[PDB]
């Protein structure tokens, strides 16, 4: 039986599918009821789902889908739309048009999320091994494809409305160090869900390690420069460090404001940290970490969130016990977020020389 | 104490859930979960017999079809559901499942059960129907089609209210350990 139910909902989500993500305001406030009642696409693909909550070895994929089905949408979790009657049928009855219109754009980004399943699925209708991890969502948010750089599902960071965000919550030996991500992705949306999570974690500071020059030739906005607003919150940073020339390190103070809620965080943008590459000194990994040192942890990120922003974590563990098994850090790492962090030899090298400098 | 064997099957969204929740519990659903398959059990007395009922909940979309029929084997009385406000799920009891019930269930009682009576006279409710050119499934209306389909009763209910919910099972009940 687990596996014709396995064919009930690759065969429903491959034609259900399609159908929420041509839903329109009008045309489904007029039609939320049937879409919610007997053979209808919301039910049914609600129903279809349940399916993988029987299946004791689909584990992982039942986690990746809870979490999916428990964001909300109006005014509840998204898995409460596939029912009449009750709190979504009364909310959308008196939903303005502006309410209506954003509920639809995200139940148009999680039905396309939601193709991954398909795809899973399908894997197992030709050699079937039940996939022992899956990358958590990414909503079309994420700088960068899973497949390139994937996300630990079990330490992704969410945002108070279950919505998740591409960043994961490093730790070592027992103990968390920093969140890491990738450089956020040039949306509304992708930038809105980015402010949010610095003062939802109340983070001691942002660190950025990407040069002008490559922020240049990849495009990446300097939000954490100006002023700009961004869905519901704004932000206004301003420098505070040094002259021009020589920018080993400009900082910046940042108030953030979501409703009637603010918080103050300080930025730290490194300037001379070539991407692939080491810093110029020893004494300058050493030095930005005492920095960064003077809920509550550090948020760094450099292009990709795997090379550059794991080795500036490993140097804060460094400074508190430069004893510290180098090789056991690494692996703790990419146990808390993704089998890349710290690839590039050249900077584990330099940490080791940290770690020998130090001990001196 | 003897045991029982009731199904409950009909279109999907009609109230089978809750309907049973309710009657088990003594409280309504705090949340919408979609139904796969599920058993729940209850302690009765019924004209000084004790018994132990067992409760069968099933899928009613369509690409179930060949799944739900697993839960046929061995049932010893039946409950077609359809919603009192939804005329063409009531349309389905004559095209769909009383054809597909007798086909596995040879022959044990069929009760055919209306739901959420609390709806019928809902003003909201009416206005709805109205605009699709529709109209509520009166009493009448349901002792026909149960007269058409051979059920040996027919029954109104409401998960939300709890008023005939009792009496639904007793009635189940009864006609099982029914005397000729
Ligand atoms: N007013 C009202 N609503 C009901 C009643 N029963 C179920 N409902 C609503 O209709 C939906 C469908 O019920 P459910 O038990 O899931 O249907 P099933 O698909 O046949 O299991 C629920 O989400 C409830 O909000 C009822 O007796 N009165
Ligand atoms: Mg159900």
Same mark, same amino acid.
């Given at each position: 039986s687990k596996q014709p139910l396995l064919d009930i909902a690759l065969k429903g989500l491959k034609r259900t599918l399609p159908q929420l993500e041509q839903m329109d305001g009008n045309s489904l406030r007029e039609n939320?009821? &049937?879409?919610?009642?007997?053979?209808?696409?919301?039910?049914?693909?609600? %129903?279809?789902?349940?399916?993988?909550?029987?299946?004791?070895?689909?584990?992982?994929?039942?986690?990746?889908?809870?979490?999916?089905?428990?964001?909300q949408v109006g005014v509840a979790r998204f898995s409460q739309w596939g029912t009449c009657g009750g709190e979504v049928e009364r909310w959308v009855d008196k939903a303005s048009t502006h309410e209506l219109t954003q509920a639809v754009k995200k139940i148009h980004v999680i039905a396309k999320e939601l193709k991954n399943v398909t795809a899973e699925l399908e894997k197992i209708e030709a050699g079937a091994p039940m996939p022992q991890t899956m990358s958590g969502p990414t909503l079309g948010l994420a700088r960068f494809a899973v497949s390139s750089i994937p996300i630990n599902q079990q330490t992704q960071v969410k945002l108070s409305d279950g919505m998740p965000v591409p960043v994961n919550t490093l730790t070592f030996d027992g103990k968390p160090v920093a969140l890491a991500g990738s450089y956020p992705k040039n949306t509304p949306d992708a930038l809105e869900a980015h402010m949010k999570m610095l003062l939802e974690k109340e983070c001691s500071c942002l660190v950025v390690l990407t040069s002008e020059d490559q922020?240049?030739?990849?495009?990446?906005?300097?939000?954490?420069?100006?002023?700009?607003?961004?869905?519901?919150?704004? !932000?206004?940073?301003?420098?505070?460090?040094?002259?021009?020339?020589?920018?080993?390190?400009?900082?910046?103070?940042?108030?953030?404001? #979501?409703?009637?809620?603010?918080?103050?965080?300080?930025?730290?943008?490194?300037?001379?940290?070539?991407?692939?590459?080491?810093?110029?000194?020893?004494?300058?990994?050493?030095?930005?970490?005492?920095?960064?040192?003077?809920? =509550?942890?550090?948020?760094?990120? #450099?292009?990709?969130?795997?090379?550059?922003?794991?080795?500036?974590?490993?140097?804060?563990?460094?400074?508190?016990?430069? =004893?510290?098994?180098? &090789?056991?850090?690494?692996?703790?790492?990419?146990?808390?977020r993704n089998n890349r962090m710290l690839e590039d030899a050249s900077q584990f090298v330099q940490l080791k020389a940290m770690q020998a400098q130090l001990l001196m | 104490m003897q045991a029982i064997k009731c199904v409950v099957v009909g279109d999907g969204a009609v109230?089978? %859930? #809750?309907?049973?929740?309710?009657?088990? !519990?003594?409280?309504?659903?705090?949340?919408?979960?979609?139904?796969?398959?599920?058993?729940?059990?209850?302690?009765?007395?019924?004209?000084?017999?004790?018994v132990n009922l067992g409760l069968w909940d099933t899928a009613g979309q369509e690409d179930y079809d060949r799944l739900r029929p697993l839960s046929y084997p061995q049932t010893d009385v039946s409950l077609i559901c359809f919603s009192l406000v939804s005329p063409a799920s009531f349309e389905n009891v004559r095209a769909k499942w009383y054809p597909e019930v007798r086909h596995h269930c040879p022959n044990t009682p069929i009760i055919l059960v209306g739901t959420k009576l609390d709806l019928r006279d809902d003003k909201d409710?009416?206005?709805?129907?109205?605009?699709?050119?529709? !109209?509520?499934? !009166?009493?009448?209306?349901?002792?026909?089609?149960?007269?058409?389909?051979?059920?040996?009763?027919?029954?109104? #209910?409401?998960?939300?209210?709890?008023?005939?919910?009792?009496?639904?099972?007793? &009635?189940?009940?009864?006609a099982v350990l029914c005397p000729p």
């Open positions: 939320f009821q &049937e879409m919610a009642s007997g053979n209808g696409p919301l039910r049914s693909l609600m %129903t279809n789902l349940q399916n993988l909550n029987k299946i004791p070895e689909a584990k992982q994929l039942n986690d990746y889908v809870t979490t999916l089905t428990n964001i922020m240049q030739a990849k495009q990446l906005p300097p939000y954490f420069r100006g002023s700009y607003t961004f869905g519901e919150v704004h !932000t206004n940073s301003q420098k505070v460090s040094s002259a021009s020339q020589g920018e080993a390190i400009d900082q910046y103070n940042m108030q953030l404001s #979501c409703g009637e809620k603010r918080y103050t965080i300080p930025v730290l943008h490194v300037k001379n940290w070539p991407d692939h590459q080491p810093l110029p000194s020893t004494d300058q990994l050493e030095y930005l970490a005492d920095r960064v040192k003077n809920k =509550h942890l550090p948020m760094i990120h #450099c292009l990709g969130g795997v090379g550059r922003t794991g080795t500036m974590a490993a140097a804060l563990v460094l400074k508190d016990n430069p =004893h510290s098994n180098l &090789e056991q850090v690494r692996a703790d790492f990419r146990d808390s | 109230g089978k %859930t #809750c309907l049973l929740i309710s009657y088990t !519990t003594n409280a309504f659903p705090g949340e919408y979960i979609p139904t796969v398959f599920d058993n729940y059990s209850a302690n009765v007395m019924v004209d000084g017999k004790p409710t009416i206005e709805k129907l109205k605009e699709k050119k529709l !109209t509520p499934i !009166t009493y009448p209306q349901g002792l026909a089609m149960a007269k058409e389909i051979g059920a040996v009763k027919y029954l109104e #209910c409401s998960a939300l209210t709890q008023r005939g919910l009792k009496t639904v099972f007793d &009635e189940a009940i009864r």
